[PDB]
Amino acid sequence: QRKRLAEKYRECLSNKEKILKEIEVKKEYLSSLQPRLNSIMQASVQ
Amino acid sequence: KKQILQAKRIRKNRQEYDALAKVIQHHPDRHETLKELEALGKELEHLSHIK
Numbered sequence: 001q002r003k004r005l006a007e008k009y010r011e012c013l014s015n016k017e018k019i020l021k022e023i024e025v026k027k028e029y030l031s032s033l034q035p036r037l038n039s040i041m042q043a044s045v046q
Numbered sequence: 047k048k049q050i051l052q053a054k055r056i057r058k059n060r061q062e063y064d065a066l067a068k069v070i071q072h073h074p075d076r077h078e079t080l081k082e083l084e085a086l087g088k089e090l091e092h093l094s095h096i097k
Binding site for chain 1: 070073074076079080082083086087089090093094096097
């Protein structure tokens with residue numbers, strides 16, 4: 001049981017690192033999207 | 047004679063118990079692992095909701 005809990009805790013650490021990687025990259029993507037939106041607004045009679 | 051045979055058998059049983067317990071004590075605790083698994087599960091659920 002201590003083996004199972006240690007391995008599952010290492011798997012949860014890897015999943016938390018993946019969630020953080022998703023989030024970091026996701027945040028960067030969101031920032032890029034915001035810049036694109038700003039560019040579109042600048043491009044934008046009406 | 048009969049009591050000393052039973053005594054050496056109980057001593058072998060105690061040494062088996064100590065041999066398993068020493069190997070268990072190279073691993074971390076149980077309840078603290080449950081607490082940190084609950085904390086990591088709550089943090090993973092929050093990070094999954096944010097993602």
